[PDB]
Amino acid sequence: LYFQGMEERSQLFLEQYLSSVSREVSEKYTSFSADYFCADEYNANVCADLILRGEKRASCSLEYWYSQKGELMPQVGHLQVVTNWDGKPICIIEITSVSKCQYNQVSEDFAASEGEGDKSLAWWQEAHRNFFSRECHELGIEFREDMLLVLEHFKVVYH
């Protein structure tokens, strides 16, 4: 009932996970999606694998999407089928926490949880400033370092 329109490969994979847990556990889930991470093939595929392996355990996005563009906030307990660029399911993640912080207040520990490149805050900054500047242009605003982010932490539950 909750994900009839999901792309078939990812729907099948998600059904495998739900069937591999007890009815009590599967029936609690109410929020589902299927997507890749990032905006390019190289990083989508690297990130799916980092997530698979437990190296990438967090992500973030501009809060502007939710407060101004009306996107639904991420929820604890959400399941995402993590695909590669080409839509092949790689793993399933469950959101474990959601919070907010300014871009310029992102910590070294959060950058390390995101797990990309050398895990440093400098690498995290270079990557995110670029990506968020592009999104901001399409949104019709300029990126500022004081903008709020939505931080998500998550865990692998299936692969």
Sites for Cl ion among residues 36-75 (CB under 5 A) = none
When the beta carbons of 100 and 155 are compared against Cl ion, the nearer one is 100
Residue 66 CB, nearest approach to Cl ion (Å): 16
DSSP output for 25-85: HHTT---EEEE-SSSSHHHHHHHHHHHHTTS--EEEEETHHHHTT-PPPP-TT-EEEEE-T
Q: How far is the CB of 94 from Cl ion (least distance, A)?
A: 25
How far, in Å, CA of 40 to CA of 74, rounded? 22
Query: How many residues touch Cl ion (CB under 5 A)?
Result: 3
Q: Residue 20 or 97: which CB sits closer to Cl ion?
A: 97
Residues 87-106 that bind Cl ion (CB under 5 A): 101-102, 105
Residue 48: closest CA among 59, 36, 31: 36
Which residues sit at the interface with Cl ion, rule CB under 5 A?
Answer: 101-102, 105
